[PDB]
Design a protein around this nucleic acid. Structure first.
Lengths: 38, 175, 211, 142, 58
RNA sequence: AACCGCUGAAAGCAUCUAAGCGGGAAGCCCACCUCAAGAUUAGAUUUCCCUAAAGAGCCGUUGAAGACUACGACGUUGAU
RNA sequence: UCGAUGUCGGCUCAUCUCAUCCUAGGGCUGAAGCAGGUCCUAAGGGUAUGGCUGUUCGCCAUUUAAAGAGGUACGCGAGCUGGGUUUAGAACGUCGUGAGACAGUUCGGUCCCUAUCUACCGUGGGCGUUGGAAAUUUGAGAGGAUCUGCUCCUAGUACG
């Protein structure tokens, strides 16, 4: 995934999910849209 | 919404809460779950209603999941759950024998997987696995564990996939 | 996991039919007489205490003589303990015998012994330190330790720093040696390998922990 | 009229039992430390040990709030370079469960010879039983 | 030291030091901390009586 | 651990997480080797002895033990 | 800090960090495979020998799984060296009328200290451990150790 300080949606299939206090972007359409904050 | 939805019990099912331990019985078998201490279970004529004890967002969220799990338990102890797996690949074949399945996918060794108690496998053909279980969680865990030995691959699709899962297809040699 | 106590008699070789020399050492094995069985109830752990060899009465104290007479065994030159378990303590009762048949041919053993004592030794021999220049103006520090630390920070020598001191004369275990031959009547154990100590020294032979 | 000290030979140390089951670690340790020092006595003199003998049972069932069970760390240094070791509250309570309450109370006691003397009176036991029925300790909710 | 001993004596009787001293100042009792600590240490019933006076003043 | 989940609500969907259940590294804690009760919390077991005992040491002959020590062996009932 | 805290480099001996060079686990890939790239986790171990130059470095040769980046008085001269720099001799170029001068060069040119205390490595003596003694021990804990190539086989299979 991309681990960066700025995580946003890159398409309409992107989803913001928080787990363990951390913000993730999960995208069902584009697996290179997967992001973690850090 | 989910929590407010009442669980409708068919004529065989019988849920009997006793000290934070709900036991759902039926023709298929018996399932159980722990009732979160922020949830009250009340049983009426062929209907079970979950309620939050002290009105709060947290209690509402917890009774929603209690309701969902109870509904899954009822439908799986009355009808059961069934997941299916397909093996794409020329030398990929699965053989269910009792509580254990032997997969010959692509390795220098067959992989032997023993099912959890609660799941039962069967192979009508040798490239399709059918798992039947009393509860959704253990059925899904068994399916995911079998799939994880050789997950689907993008370039040719080979591997163990689910029945209703779509595999993203990549192209070799795109120039 | 019970073993036996023997005496190193020295090394020789065993030739194979294919024409390979096997370096072996010979362990003299007098019978290991069980002087005490320890258990969870009385001791809190399970073990076999044995004595081997012989000691004269003038050298056996009254306390030790009573301890041996309780078992009904003749006093040996020493007393050793072997950590056992429920399966090990099966048929081993006080006053019994442990012979060389505890080990079979071809099986892996660990041998513990007292290393040969080198006395006080410098860093070069004790810790494989490099020597410093024999020539090229080196003044008087050919076998010297060299630097022992850093500057003002940390301002000390760290613990466990390799230095001169006593070397050898310590308890050493060599693991994974093969039993070449066993002779209970002769009291003889032939083991492939080197086995710490000098000939005459007490050695402990136990079934291998690696296996 | 002078202010008198407690005269060590005239002091008696009473025995009490504390059930640690489900209590907060620090909040129980403050009370145990005060009892061990002897602060509840009107003859309290700072250089005399006038405290009680506290026997603590169910020491492994002491509780911590928040995520402190998994996140409170206990360090130690061995004296060797790089020799800093860390354990957890949960793992420490699995391994040596009396250490958790012992550490809490030892930090809350005076750091000297009289502090060492007065922590001798702390008797910690994981589980429901203690071996000091001969001392007849009275139950002390604290 | 006196304050520590008075706090112990008052807590034996169901009061803290900061409420007991307030109760004395409200009752117009002028006994100093040295004498109060002496009474707490060497005369428990008299200190009980003083605590009763302070507690009636609160 | 990263990462990957199962079931699952908050948020009718979705969702590895909030309740609950998994997988997962030469890393962590054990396991292996050595030391270790001055662990002053100084532990345990077996024997022996108490009107100078049981023992220990001095001394002697000494040792693949050793700077001195210590440790090991033996001192006429003896191969030191 | 000038009633003095010895410079650079080497040798010896280190110790820590992680911003990871190899090995380990992963996500993504313009990832078919083999190889990679990037990022995440990870500090347990490991992490060359030469030619040149006083070098550190650097270039190069040949290797290696790899030939890490750093901190530690740019770690370490009461541990060693003394090639460079930085005394007194001499010379060249240059500047100066000159005495002389030059982060210009060149040839030459004394490196002390028996360790009190802390530390550390070993090894003893004392006392204590609720009478003494001969042994055997449990283990709270501490240290050590932790690397990795290649071949064969699966299989010239999967993939192409």
């Amino acid at each position: 995934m991309k681990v960066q300080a700025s995580v946003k949606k890159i398409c309409g299939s992107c989803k913001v999910v928080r787990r363990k206090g951390r913000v993730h972007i999960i995208c069902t359409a584009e697996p290179r849209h997967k992001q973690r904050q850090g | 919404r989910v929590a407010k939805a009442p669980v409708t019990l068919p004529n065989g099912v019988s849920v009997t809460l006793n000290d934070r331990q709900v036991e759902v019985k039926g023709k298929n078998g018996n399932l159980s779950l722990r009732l979160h201490d922020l949830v009250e279970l009340k049983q009426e004529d062929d209907v079970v209603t979950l309620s939050p004890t002290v009105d709060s967002k947290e209690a509402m969220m917890h009774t929603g999941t209690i309701r969902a799990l109870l509904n899954n338990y009822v439908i799986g102890v009355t009808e059961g759950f069934e997941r299916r797996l397909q093996l794409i690949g020329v030398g990929y074949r699965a053989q269910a024998t009792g509580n254990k399945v032997t997969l010959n996918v692509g390795y220098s060794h067959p992989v032997e997987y023993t099912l959890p108690e609660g799941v039962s496998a069967e192979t009508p053909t040798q490239t399709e696995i059918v798992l039947k279980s009393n509860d959704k969680q253990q059925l899904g865990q068994a399916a995911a564990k079998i799939r994880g030995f050789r997950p689907p691959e993008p370039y040719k699709g080979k591997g163990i996939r689910y029945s209703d899962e779509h595999v993203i297809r990549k192209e070799a040699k795109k120039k | 996991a019970i073993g036996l106590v023997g005496k190193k008699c020295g090394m020789t070789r065993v030739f194979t039919e294919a024409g390979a020399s096997i370096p072996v050492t010979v362990v003299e094995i007098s019978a290991n007489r069980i002087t005490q069985v320890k258990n969870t109830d009385v001791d809190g752990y399970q073990a076999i205490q044995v004595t081997t060899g012989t000691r004269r009465d003038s050298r056996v104290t009254a306390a030790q003589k009573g301890h041996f007479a309780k078992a009904g065994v003749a006093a040996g030159r020493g007393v050793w303990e072997f950590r056992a378990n429920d399966s090990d303590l099966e048929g081993r009762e006080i006053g019994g015998e442990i012979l060389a048949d505890l080990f079979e041919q071809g099986q892996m053993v660990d041998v513990t012994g007292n290393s040969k004592g080198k006395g006080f030794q410098g860093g070069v021999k004790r810790h494989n330190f490099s020597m410093q220049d024999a020539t090229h103006g080196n003044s008087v520090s050919h076998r010297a330790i060299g630097s022992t630390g850093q500057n003002q920070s940390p301002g000390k020598v760290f613990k466990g720093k390799k230095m001169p001191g006593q070397m050898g004369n310590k308890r050493v275990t060599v693991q994974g040696l093969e039993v070449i031959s066993v002779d209970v009547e002769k009291g003889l154990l032939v083991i492939k390998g080197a086995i710490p100590g000098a000939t005459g020294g007490d050695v402990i032979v136990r079934p291998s922990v690696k296996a | 009229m002078k202010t008198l000290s407690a005269k060590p030979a005239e002091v008696t140390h009473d025995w009490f039992v504390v059930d640690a089951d489900g209590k907060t670690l620090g909040r129980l340790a403050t009370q145990i430390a005060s009892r061990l020092r002897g602060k509840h006595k009107t003859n309290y003199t700072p250089h005399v040990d006038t405290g009680d003998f506290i026997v603590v049972i169910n020491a492994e069932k002491i509780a911590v709030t928040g995520k402190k069970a998994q996140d409170k760390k206990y360090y130690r240094h061995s004296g060797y370079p790089g020799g800093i070791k860390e354990t957890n509250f949960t793992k420490l309570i699995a391994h040596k469960p009396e250490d958790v309450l012992h550490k809490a109370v030892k930090g809350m006691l005076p750091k000297g010879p009289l502090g060492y003397a007065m922590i001798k009176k702390l008797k910690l036991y994981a589980g429901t039983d203690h071996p000091h029925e001969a001392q007849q300790p009275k139950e002390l909710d604290i | 030291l006196w304050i520590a001993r008075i706090n112990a004596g008052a807590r034996l009787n169901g009061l803290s030091y900061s409420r007991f001293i307030n109760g004395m100042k409200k009752a117009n009792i002028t006994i100093d901390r040295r004498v109060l600590a002496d009474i707490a240490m060497h005369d428990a019933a008299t200190f009980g009586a003083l605590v009763e006076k302070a507690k009636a003043e609160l």
